[PDB]
Design a protein around this ligand. Structure first.
Ligand SMILES: Cc1cc2nc3c(=O)[nH]c(=O)nc-3n(C[C@H](O)[C@H](O)[C@H](O)COP(=O)(O)OP(=O)(O)OC[C@H]3O[C@@H](n4cnc5c(N)ncnc54)[C@H](O)[C@@H]3O)c2cc1C
Ligand SMILES: NC(=O)c1ccc[n+]([C@@H]2O[C@H](COP(=O)([O-])OP(=O)(O)OC[C@H]3O[C@@H](n4cnc5c(N)ncnc54)[C@H](OP(=O)(O)O)[C@@H]3O)[C@@H](O)[C@H]2O)c1
Ligand SMILES: Cc1cc2nc3c(=O)[nH]c(=O)nc-3n(C[C@H](O)[C@H](O)[C@H](O)COP(=O)(O)O)c2cc1C
Length: 603
């Protein structure tokens, strides 16, 4: 009658989503989620928390193999959507014991806001505190970029997880049907292009992401003197493309999977890699006509369109589960999709940590040979790799310069893995082309040259700063007056990986670089980092930042370097403020919204 647990017994439901929308979205999902409830020996209903009193969750253990999904959108200061208000205030003042209740939450938000997903995160952790049994990890949907994905990527893994737990079954269900060709003009077949059919053969402007330019490699060289790593310098020709860049922009390139890696797939798969085929969307009523540009051969798809390198998501292994002859190896592939337990352990342990790519999985689980085409629909799309530009538009504006470290590590899975973009970018011979484009950014130098410039950026992070310390040196030699120009670079040793040593000490000698504070981390007994050298110079630095009106730039790995360095500045703004931490932060805060502090971090 009222207890929404009872309105489920009279209807035969064993699952109920709860939209917490305020402008649509949430409910949209809530439904679409329980409308799938069918395909898996279950059936749900999407209800609104406003009505039925939620305190009735305690009745949920009455229905067998019951579940409850939450789709809460977040508004204002972590404010709970209007209809979720009561459910919210309840979750706080309450103390009821929701033991046995199985759940899962999927919040919607937008990183742009301070309290990002404060609602989805609360209704999530607040249930566990009351004694729930999280069935699947919290879903953090971020509208800012793309929400549908986040959700689709979440539901893509949610169900196989609700199965391995509850017991329900699937039923394959392909998303594309195959169509092979016994003719096709070789000139109406995709062979690596990204958009325009033949835009790689007849390069026609304007050049951007949808239609990349094929820059030629004028020079490729080993920047580091060490031999444990391979840092290189790539120069790409952009002459004849009107592609105008600026120090501080990124240059994205479209890699080609590994020749040997690819071909070595068809072999163990026992498949004809050169059959000009075409995947069609079983839902003619949509944009997504094909997963990748078709018609094309498989070989081309695994080379320019598919990502056969990053470890497969739990769901992809769970859908490839079937194509395993063994009853043992399949059992595994199924478990990986576990929400928790030794299944997830193994997953993170055997797949994500060990770093087993698809070919690796096909060879360690031999009784697993999926039909080629299906696989070429389960794998994700090959992604473009971005790099920070080491050149200056004021200097050679026809050569996009790249500085980047090659990936090639012995993996926990036995074999040695190589980077798709870096391995591919290492073999180019100085006509070798490099599909690419430029991504405009907000990483720029000051308008007025007189403005001081502090640049913190170790290792391959030096990159953007070389572009800078070339445009600054240009301006000097071009009449204009240039303010100070400090640099805080770092590495392991000087006889190992001291990048652009001559190019640098060269600029120091002439003026481009007022100072070249380099922090080696393995020269001496202990460790030395670029945040120590800032602390040391805090004295000077405060004055450049405070009175000088300098701009700051930090660039390199986002993980620890970005964090530790920025910490130091807080310590600096506070010591010489004087002000308490927070105080200090809001100083750097505004500097950010000013353009005097700017991050070009990546990890
Ligand atoms: C805005 C932006 C700018 C960038 N600028 C640069 C730049 O200037 N220079 C540069 O070198 N890179 C830069 N990168 C990183 C670069 O795009 C690639 O990540 C790098 O070239 C690696 O090869 P892939 O490009 O082929 O990477 P992949 O082959 O796809 O491999 C990347 C993955 O390899 C794994 N990996 C790496 N080392 C190990 C290890 N020891 N053990 C286990 N797994 C490991 C990780 O899982 C990592 O996610 C940037 C990224 C962004 C988003
Ligand atoms: N778990 C680990 O063992 C570990 C640790 C750090 C980074 N990494 C990985 O390696 C990548 C680094 O990029 P890269 O190869 O281009 O860098 P890199 O050129 O090899 O190194 C750049 C410089 O940063 C230093 N550094 C490391 N941690 C730092 C910290 N917390 N604060 C300040 N400086 C620090 C390095 O010292 P050292 O080489 O002596 O550490 C080195 O001098 C990261 O993306 C990260 O994912 C892994
Ligand atoms: C006034 C307003 C405030 C918002 N505040 C936040 C917020 O603090 N945190 C967050 O993660 N998202 C915030 N969002 C984004 C929404 O949560 C997101 O767009 C969500 O998809 C809306 O879902 P709905 O259509 O189901 O109501 C806000 C949106 C508006 C219009």
């Amino acid at each position: 009658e009222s207890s929404f647990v009872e309105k489920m017994k009279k209807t035969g439901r064993n699952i109920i989503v709860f939209y917490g929308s305020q402008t649509g979205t949430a409910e949209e999902f809530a439904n679409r989620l329980s409308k799938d409830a069918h395909r898996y020996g279950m059936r749900g209903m999407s209800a609104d928390p406003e009505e039925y009193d939620l305190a009735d969750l305690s009745s949920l253990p009455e229905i067998d193999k019951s579940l409850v999904v939450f789709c809460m959108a977040t508004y204002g200061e972590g404010d709970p959507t209007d209809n979720a208000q009561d459910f919210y205030d309840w979750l706080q003042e309450t103390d009821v014991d929701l033991t046995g209740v199985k759940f899962a939450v999927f919040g919607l938000g937008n990183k742009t806001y301070e309290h990002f997903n404060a609602m989805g995160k609360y209704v999530d952790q607040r249930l566990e505190q009351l004694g729930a049994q999280r069935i699947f990890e919290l879903g953090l949907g971020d509208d800012d970029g793309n929400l549908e994905e986040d959700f689709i990527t979440w539901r893509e893994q949610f169900w196989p997880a609700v199965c391995e737990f509850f017991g329900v079954e699937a039923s394959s269900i392909r998303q594309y049907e195959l169509v092979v060709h016994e003719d096709m003009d070789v000139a109406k077949v995709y062979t690596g292009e990204m958009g325009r059919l033949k835009s790689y053969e007849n390069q026609k402007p304007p050049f951007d992401a949808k239609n990349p330019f094929l820059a030629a490699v004028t020079a490729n060289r080993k920047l580091n003197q060490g031999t444990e790593r391979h840092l290189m310098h790539l120069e790409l020709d952009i002459s004849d493309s009107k592609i105008r860049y600026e120090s501080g922009d990124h240059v994205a390139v479209y890699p080609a999977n590994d020749s040997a890696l690819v071909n070595q797939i068809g072999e163990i798969l026992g498949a004809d890699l050169d059959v000009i085929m075409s995947l069609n969307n079983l839902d003619e009523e949509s944009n997504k006509k094909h997963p990748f540009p078709c018609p094309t051969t498989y070989r081309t798809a695994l080379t320019y369109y598919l990502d056969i390198t990053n470890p497969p998501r739990t769901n992809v292994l769970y859908e490839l589960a079937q194509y395993a002859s063994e009853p043992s190896e399949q059992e595994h592939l199924h478990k990986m999709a576990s929400s928790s337990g030794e299944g997830k352990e193994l997953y993170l342990s055997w797949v994500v940590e060990a770093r087993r790519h698809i070919l690796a999985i096909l060879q360690d689980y031999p009784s697993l040979r999926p039909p080629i085409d299906h696989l070429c629909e389960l794998l994700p799309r090959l992604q473009a790799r971005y790099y920070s530009i080491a050149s200056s538009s004021k200097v050679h504006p026809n050569s996009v310069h790249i500085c980047a470290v090659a990936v090639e590590y012995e993996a926990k899975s036995g074999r040695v893995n190589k980077g798709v973009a870096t391995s591919w970018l290492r073999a180019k011979e100085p006509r070798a082309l490099v599909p690419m484009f430029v991504r405009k950014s907000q990483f720029r130098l000051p308008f007025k040259s007189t403005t001081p410039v502090i640049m913190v950026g170790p290792g391959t992070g030096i990159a953007p700063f070389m572009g800078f310390i070339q445009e600054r040196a240009w301006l000097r030699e071009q009449g204009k007056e240039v303010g100070e120009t400090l640099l805080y670079y770092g590495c392991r040793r000087s006889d190992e990986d001291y990048l652009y040593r001559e190019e640098l000490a060269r600029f120091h000698k002439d003026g481009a670089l007022t100072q070249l504070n380099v922090a080696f981390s393995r020269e001496q007994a202990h460790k030395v980092y670029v945040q120590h050298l800032l602390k040391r110079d805090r004295e000077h630095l405060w004055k450049l930042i405070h009175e000088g009106g300098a701009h700051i730039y930090v660039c390199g790995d986002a993980r620890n370097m970005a964090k530790d360095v920025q910490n130091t500045f807080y310590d600096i703004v506070a010591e010489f403020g004087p002000m308490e931490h927070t105080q200090a932060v809001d100083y750097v805060k505004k500097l950010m919204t000013k353009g005097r502090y700017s991050l070009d971090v990546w990890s």
